[PDB]
From Swiss-Prot:
<protein>
    <recommendedName>
        <fullName>Roundabout homolog 3</fullName>
    </recommendedName>
</protein>
<feature type="glycosylation site" description="N-linked (GlcNAc...) asparagine">
    <location>
        <position position="150"/>
    </location>
</feature>
<feature type="glycosylation site" description="N-linked (GlcNAc...) asparagine">
    <location>
        <position position="114"/>
    </location>
</feature>
<comment type="similarity">
    <text>Belongs to the immunoglobulin superfamily. ROBO family.</text>
</comment>
<feature type="domain" description="Fibronectin type-III 3">
    <location>
        <begin position="101"/>
        <end position="196"/>
    </location>
</feature>
<comment type="function">
    <text>Receptor involved in axon guidance during development. Acts as a multifunctional regulator of pathfinding that simultaneously mediates NELL2 repulsion, inhibits SLIT repulsion, and facilitates Netrin-1/NTN1 attraction. In spinal cord development plays a role in guiding commissural axons probably by preventing premature sensitivity to Slit proteins thus inhibiting Slit signaling through ROBO1/ROBO2. Binding OF NELL2 to the receptor ROBO3 promotes oligomerization of ROBO3, resulting in the repulsion of commissural axons in the midline.</text>
</comment>
<feature type="domain" description="Fibronectin type-III 2">
    <location>
        <begin position="4"/>
        <end position="96"/>
    </location>
</feature>
<feature type="glycosylation site" description="N-linked (GlcNAc...) asparagine">
    <location>
        <position position="143"/>
    </location>
</feature>
<comment type="subunit">
    <text>Monomer. Interacts (via Fibronectin type-III 1 domain) with NELL2 (via the EGF domains) with a 3:3 stoichiometry; this interaction promotes oligomerization of ROBO3 resulting in the repulsion of commissural axons in the midline.</text>
</comment>
Length: 196
């Protein structure tokens, strides 16, 4: 089980956040009864998987974090235990649009003129960003599209000033974060209706 050597091939993406991992075997093949695949973010603790057959020389890792580097190793198992670890391979998981909204969206009166608001926010949860945040989209939607207010802000911004709200109109204020892959999910709306 120590003489056997595992040869890891280059991983292949199937569905989003997946990696098809395959390998060949060289040595006393008759001793192997299965394989234990281990993977981690290149970080955190290793995640292990047990394969109950010596013919399963491939597996599909799923739900891998977008915008990260995944490190993969594989070893053979038998009646003795576990064998030598193969050489690790590392592949990048493509960034995605954020899957979680910015946190703590708030609205305050303030800005230019007499009917402006300042919208503030915090980034999405780190596990929901799916990449480096490069942009925030801010919307102030009325009942008609001619009343919509929209601004963009840089990844370092945490506020945006929106002017020209019509008194008496109900506005839905939303913020979304974006990565290089696109604009993510918007926050729950903060409703604003200025006095008239």
């Amino acid at each position: 089980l120590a003489e056997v050597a595992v040869r890891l091939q280059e991983p292949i993406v199937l569905g989003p956040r997946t990696l098809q991992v395959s390998w060949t075997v060289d040595g006393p093949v008759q001793l192997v009864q299965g394989f234990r695949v281990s993977w981690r973010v290149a970080g955190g603790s290793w995640t292990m998987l047990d394969l109950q057959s010596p013919s399963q020389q491939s597996t599909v890792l799923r739900g891998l974090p977008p915008g990260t580097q995944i490190q993969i190793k594989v070893q053979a198992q038998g009646q003795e235990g576990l064998g030598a670890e193969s050489l690790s391979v590392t592949r990048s998981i493509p960034e995605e649009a954020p899957s979680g909204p910015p946190q703590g969206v708030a609205v305050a009166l303030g800005g230019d003129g007499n009917s402006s608001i300042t919208v503030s926010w915090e980034p999405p949860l780190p596990s929901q960003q799916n990449g480096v945040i490069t942009e925030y989209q801010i919307w102030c939607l009325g009942n008609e599209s001619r009343f919509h207010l929209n601004r963009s802000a840089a990844g370092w911004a945490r506020s945006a000033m929106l002017r020209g709200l019509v008194p008496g109109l109900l506005y839905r204020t939303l913020v979304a974060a974006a990565t290089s892959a696109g604009v993510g999910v918007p926050s729950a709306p903060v409703l604003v209706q200025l006095p008239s």
